[PDB]
Ligand binder design. Structure first.
Ligand SMILES: *[C@H](O)[C@H](C[C@@H]1CCNC1=O)NC(=O)[C@H](CC(C)C)NC(=O)OC[C@@H]1CCC(=O)N1CC1CCC(F)(F)CC1
Ligand SMILES: *[C@H](O)[C@H](C[C@@H]1CCNC1=O)NC(=O)[C@H](CC(C)C)NC(=O)OC[C@@H]1CCC(=O)N1CC1CCC(F)(F)CC1
Lengths: 305, 305
């Protein structure tokens, strides 16, 4: 029995119309054009020779407006003249002389561990694919990004408003990815330099595991549900010892508890038992806990909320 | 170590600009507007009372052009006057008096089992999500579709050309989905009626399992590779007895064999052994064979081809 769950991304058209190519000398990557501003990773200013110890303050001072070339390729082609430049953290903010006529309603936000967002992967200012990821507890994402993908953007949508939350910067040694928020801070403790970096330990996202167990119940799969219960306080002490995030309930989780009639605390107990092993059984086709689906995913895709 | 594989969909903007709402009396669903034609499922003509034994020939004759209401909501709003109507298999072909000014270059094709395509899920003519699926050997897809989703479209893209291959029609008893090709035929043996239907047995897609084992090798994971080999002929005899599709090699698979230095026949042997059990080991985070990634996915996402 198929769960009705898929990895669902937002339709990408609104964001496709904002993607541009940014070139600075021997470097090219993607940028995001909103109003009269183009955002892109600041390492577009770095010669590949110096990526391991760049002085971005000196690189920035060495640039003029004419140092940058901004091009839109798709749909409504355009070469955009740069008329100002500035650095904010790990991003450049270029000012251009034409306002994007397809600028959507938008905000900038930071995404939290366990939360999902959509990514528009782009190369040379051309969108090539879209996928959805969850921000991991160690502030990486399990993406699919190759050389040239930097400046690809991640976002959520509330109504018609696009909430931009990620601009792609780098791949870590274990194959995961990270990037910047639009305040210019890198997610986690990462730096935008080509150097070995401590990567922090990942954890299971407890709230998303709970969501997935509710999805199982909503599909008629509830063998793992018992009367037994573990309190949030007791579960969270256990989680710190067992590489789980601490559980924080939300209204979205509460809606799943009400729909199914199964208490959160019953599923916190189930998680503790299932972590020790599924004893040969499956849940929604899986022999391991799944934490890549959020309570909101389950509410939307299964309950139509 | 993350594989670098995700479920990747095409950017959806080109197709978003083709989606419309079609209403016929008490029924509303989605349609696809290309040139002066709007395609939609023919059960928009059926009153919910009669969905179990409709006479679509009589329903069609009972309609006039004014029976249909076509509306575009997003981006460039419009009410489209219907000036002709026709049935092709399980689809209606409505002719409208305005050509879609955003019609992309397009073709119609039929997708084969094991092949992947992108879906734009829509409700009331409004795109709400995108995801990618593989056509299963029993001509269903493991989608995410709720009431109102019919007329949602699936497609592939070659260059700038969109190859439309699926128009959503129904959910089966096991939670999977199926629909029509744009020649109006339903995939598989399914009919567009609200009646119990024999559903055929699914199978593992052998070529995609091979692709995934190559993805594992490309990520440094090759414990399952031995000198031992099973011929395609011998594997295909085994597959018929073990709920696997017969293996048919392609140039995309050959490219993976050349890059990795591991022969297809080595992986056909591995599959036979892994099917009997992973003996407590994991491949790319999984304790079971994965068949939802195609050779083309692996070439594109990991090898950048
Ligand atoms: C921008 O387009 C690009 C995107 C990368 C390329 C490959 N996949 C991506 O997501 N970003 C970079 O190349 C980035 C640039 C710096 C200045 C921020 N560098 C980067 O991602 O380098 C990661 C390297 C290459 C692959 C890999 O495993 N690592 C990390 C690893 C390098 C060796 C080590 F010893 F230093 C340990 C860390
Ligand atoms: C069109 O918007 C809609 C899309 C469906 C709704 C739910 N999810 C979807 O993908 N299509 C239909 O409702 C479709 C209409 C007919 C005329 C083609 N009917 C349909 O999908 O019905 C499927 C039903 C409802 C859920 C379910 O399990 N089944 C199949 C099952 C019904 C009972 C049975 F005994 F007949 C055995 C088969």
């Amino acid at each position: 029995h198929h769960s009705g769950l898929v990895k669902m991304s937002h339709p990408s058209g609104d964001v496709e119309a904002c993607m541009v190519q940014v070139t600075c000398g021997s470097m090219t990557l993607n940028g995001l054009w909103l109003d009269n501003t183009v955002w892109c990773p600041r390492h577009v200013m770095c010669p590949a020779d110096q990526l391991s110890d760049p002085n971005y303050d000196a690189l920035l001072i060495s640039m003029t407006n004419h140092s940058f070339s901004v091009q839109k390729h798709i749909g409504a082609p355009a070469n955009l003249r740069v008329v100002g430049h500035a650095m904010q953290g790990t991003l450049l903010k270029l000012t251009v002389d034409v306002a994007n006529p397809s600028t959507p309603a938008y905000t900038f936000t930071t995404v939290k561990p366990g939360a999902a967002f959509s990514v528009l992967a782009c190369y040379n200012g051309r969108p090539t694919g879209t996928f959805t990821v969850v921000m991991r507890p160690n502030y990486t994402i399990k993406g699919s990004f190759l050389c040239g993908s930097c400046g690809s953007v991640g976002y959520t949508k509330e109504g018609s408003v696009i909430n931009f939350c990620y601009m792609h910067q780098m791949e870590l040694a274990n194959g995961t990815h990270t990037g910047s928020a639009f305040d210019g801070t890198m997610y986690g403790a990462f730096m935008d330099k080509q150097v070995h970096q401590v990567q922090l330990t990942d954890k299971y996202c407890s709230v998303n595991v709970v969501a997935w167990l509710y999805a199982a119940i909503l599909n008629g799969c509830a063998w793992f549900v018992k009367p037994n219960r573990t309190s949030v306080v007791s579960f969270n002490e256990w989680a710190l010892a067992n590489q789980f995030t601490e559980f924080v309930g939300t209204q979205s989780v509460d809606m799943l508890a009400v729909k199914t009639g199964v208490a959160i605390e019953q599923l916190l107990y189930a998680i503790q038992q299932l972590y020790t092993g599924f004893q040969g059984k499956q849940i929604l086709g899986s022999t391991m806990l799944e934490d890549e689906f959020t309570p909101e995913d389950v509410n939307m895709q299964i309950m139509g909320v």
